[PDB]
């Protein structure tokens, strides 16, 4: 529900990439297959993690505590 | 003049439910998953 | 068979009351010591017998 | 604390380790599945160039 | 007495036994229970 | 001379942290309580995927 | 368990985590697979029922 | 991995693959009987109970 | 006879013993030597897992009706054989009491606990020289008020009088004996909130009155002759502390109270307005 | 060493089903017995047979 | 049918099965957690008394 | 911890955070120190305060 740290299969650290990736996607208008390659996620094991993550934590944060 | 006769269980999000018209930001306020 | 079954035994006159273990009570929460059906039907038999004894 | 991956994947200092030998298949350590032509359907490795065909 | 927290008003409560199960500031009837103070240990495994 | 206990133990095979405990009254003003316990299940050998 | 090969006697080997493990060939008599099938174990409590298992 | 088993990867399990949370919640409630006998939420001792 | 069993480790014997029940093994063991005293323990929750003697006692019952496989020349006689023993039992007046009071408290929109205390409060007295009839209402009118207050919900006499017309007098004498029936067998705060809701007010106006009425009660001002009235004046005291239109005339009929007791009751308030300042 | 066959290989959505093994392992030697019939009770939850 | 012809029993276990290409045809792998529970009453003789003493 | 994540969830993420361990031989396996389970000869202690402002 948030940004896994390291890629499951691979171990590569990936959880310092979600914001950089979202921003790449959003301000520079890249497509993912290019956003990802720019963050260095080359193995499709690592691409899976970011490309496919679902950032549910934003929806949790809405519930006022 | 008008008489109580009993209580009708309400289906959620139906015209008569508090949520029927609530807005997302309001659904969170009530703690209901949108 | 005149030792083990006379035909006149198919008509109940006495009734054998099974001991508790056949119909144990569920002693639950110090007041819900619920009772087995066979206790009930037996009560309900015993009443309906107790009554008819008077009515003669 | 100090530990090794063999005990939990967190104590692991390496990510994916590539590894490859004999990129032309000279040793015949693998046999290639194919439909018409093996040489077409299996892309050359990068390393396939550091050894002569 | 022990701490509690209103479900909605969200105010620490500290009622006792044989007090009403009821929130100040909103007679809301749901209280949480003001998580423990002793530390708790997990493994990052 | 006083009292027989009627407490509710955790299941014989479960564990994990109490997550939250809330205290209210039913419709009839009787106190009652709901405890939620949280566990983490890590995939294991006999698990079904 | 609809034929006598659905109950055979095995020898224990004690292993770690919580599944029964059995050889693969034995699987077709039991008619089992490993998608969550469960199987039951019965331990013989005597010196002579033991030999009934091992020998029959 | 025969007969519908599978081999899973232990390292990927360590890094989070398929972990999950489990939440079991228990309810309990104290009953009144005749305003004579009335269950109570308390912590008992082996001396009074 | 004494028909009694006690367990004690015959090889420690030291005590009224220190034994533990290992349920999951169906054992009891001397907590000292671990000799198992007795086994094959029988379950204790599964029993009622598959599933009123305080009222229905020992003369039991069973609802007898018609099954699928019976014609009406046998069904209706089950309705014509069940009727021969309804007078040896006063229990009609026992159950039809409960059924009546159940019909009452339930129609009265009451918590199902009060129903029991009244199902009790009937059953406990249920025949006395003090009772000796007395219309069989006043008890079901007081045993409810008993069953209500004894269940920590207090309602006014008029409120029950709305449910049952008891001539307001057959009530009073019946109550006194009844209360003393249990004393031998052995709280107006409840009115503040039920009133506010009857006027549909937010919690603070009701919140305050608990302070005010208690504080108006705590020092002086016996004030009222059935303090029902001097409850409401706290609302009137506090409603005027707020500015919400509950004009006196609307108060009265909504709560069925004299208006006179209000203003004169409010006399002791337009003068006592000193010490109720929380904020 | 190179495997002599080549492996079909790539991602695939897998779901983790509800049937964890720890909720299923069950053993019993001499537990409690039913009341009416005095055979072992039923159900893993209550230490059945 | 349900209480005489068949019944529930002590000394049994049930769990999920798995395969093992490294057990003999007749072994079964038993989880240590289960083996700790099921039990077998052995008789003390001269031939095992010390070994049984160890277990105790 | 009043965040929207469970403790063992957060604790699990902390484990995977890769710490500088260039000079790791100068530490000891926490089962070789004789400390009451941990000391500076066998472990490093960090802390984390965060508050949503
Ligand atoms: Mg199967
Ligand atoms: Zn990777
Ligand atoms: Zn002893
Ligand atoms: Zn140390």
UniProtKB/Swiss-Prot annotation, chain I:
Pfam families: TFIIB, Zn_Ribbon_TF
InterPro entries attached to this UniProt entry: Cyclin-like_dom, Cyclin-like_sf, TFIIB, TFIIB_CS, TFIIB_cyclin, Znf_TFIIB
Domain of life assignment: Eukaryota
Chief location of this protein within or outside the cell: nucleus
Sequence ranges of the Sequence repeats: 104-180, 195-271
GO cellular component: nucleus; transcription preinitiation complex
Compartment(s): Nucleus
Zn-finger segments (TFIIB-type): 5-38
GO molecular function: RNA polymerase II complex binding; RNA polymerase II complex recruiting activity; RNA polymerase II general transcription initiation factor activity; TBP-class protein binding; zinc ion binding
Positions with a binding annotation for Zn(2+): 9, 12, 30, 33
GO biological process: DNA-templated transcription initiation; RNA polymerase II preinitiation complex assembly; transcription open complex formation at RNA polymerase II promoter; transcriptional start site selection at RNA polymerase II promoter
Keyword entries, A-Z: Metal-binding, Nucleus, Repeat, Transcription, Transcription regulation, Zinc, Zinc-finger
Family: Belongs to the TFIIB family.
Subunit relationships: Associates with TFIID-IIA (DA complex) to form TFIID-IIA-IIB (DAB-complex) which is then recognized by polymerase II.
Role description: General factor that plays a major role in the activation of eukaryotic genes transcribed by RNA polymerase II.
Remarks, miscellaneous: Present with 6750 molecules/cell in log phase SD medium.
Protein name per Swiss-Prot or TrEMBL: Transcription initiation factor IIB
